[PDB]
């Protein structure tokens, strides 16, 4: 009906072009490597790990997810899979290594969001 599907796409594309950071894809087997990927890293602090509320020790880990552009993944030949690692090569991100765990359902035209886990 409307052109909103394209407006939304261009919006997401500009959001990425402005807020993305470079990354490196290293697959689980480390057989293939793809550098200079652009991803957006969303990290929120979490304290987790206690079974039920048994009184076990928690660890501090993030609730975090990485936004990709699908066009770029297809262009660069990247087939994201569980266990694959994203390294943040930007200066000052300490080469944080993020292990892809599971993918969020693709809603919308430009981006795909993976829930990941900090590994270092």
Partner 1 sequence: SQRLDILKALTAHLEQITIANGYAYDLKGKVYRGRDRFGADFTSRLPIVSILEAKATDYGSFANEEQTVRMDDWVLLVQGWVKDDPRNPTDPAYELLAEVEKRLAMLVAKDEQGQPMYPALYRLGGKIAKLTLAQPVVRPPEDGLSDTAFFFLPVRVGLKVDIRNP
Partner 2 sequence: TPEECRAQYRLMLKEAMDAYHQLNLGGSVRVVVDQNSERVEYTAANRQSLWAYIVRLQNAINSDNPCAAFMGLPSSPAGFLFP
Residues that bind partner 2 in the complex, under the rule CB under 8 A: 3, 7-8, 10-12, 14-15, 107-108
Residue 35 or 104: the one with the smaller Cβ distance to partner 1 is 104
Binding partner of residue 14 among partner 1, partner 2, none, CB cut-off 5 to 8 Å per kind: partner 2
Buried (b) or exposed (e) across 28-58, using 16+ Cβ within 10 A?
A: eeeeeeeeebebbbeeeeeeeeeeeeeeeee
Binding partner of residue 12 among partner 2, partner 1, none, CB cut-off 5 to 8 Å per kind: partner 2
Residue 15 or 21: the one with the smaller Cβ distance to partner 2 is 15
3-state SS string for the chain: CCCHHHHHHHHHHHHHHHHCEEEEEECCCCCCEEEEEEEEEEEEEEEECCCCCCCCCCEEEEEEEEEEEHHHHHHHCCCCCCCCEEECCCCCCCCCEEEEEEECCCCCCCEEEEEEEECC
Residue 52 or 91: the one with the smaller Cβ distance to partner 1 is 52
Q: Which residues bind partner 1 (CB under 8 A)?
A: 51-52, 54, 80-82, 101-106, 115
CB of 69 to partner 1, least distance (A): 17
Residue 12 or 89: the one with the smaller Cβ distance to partner 1 is 12
CB of 30 to partner 1, least distance (A): 19
């Amino acid at each position: 009906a409307s052109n909103f599907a394209a407006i939304k796409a261009k919006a997401r594309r500009d959001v990425h072009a402005s807020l993305s950071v470079p990354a490196r894809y290293e697959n689980y087997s480390q057989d293939v490597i793809v550098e200079d990927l652009s991803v957006r890293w969303h990290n929120k602090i979490a304290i987790m790990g206690d079974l039920e509320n048994g009184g076990y020790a928690n660890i501090v880990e993030g609730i975090e997810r990485i936004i990709f552009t699908r066009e770029e993944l297809a262009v660069k030949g990247v087939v994201l899979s569980e266990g694959d690692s994203i390294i943040m090569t930007a200066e000052g991100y300490e080469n944080a290594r993020l292990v892809l765990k599971t993918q969020e359902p693709i809603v919308g035209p430009v981006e795909v969001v993976w829930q990941v886990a900090r590994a270092d």
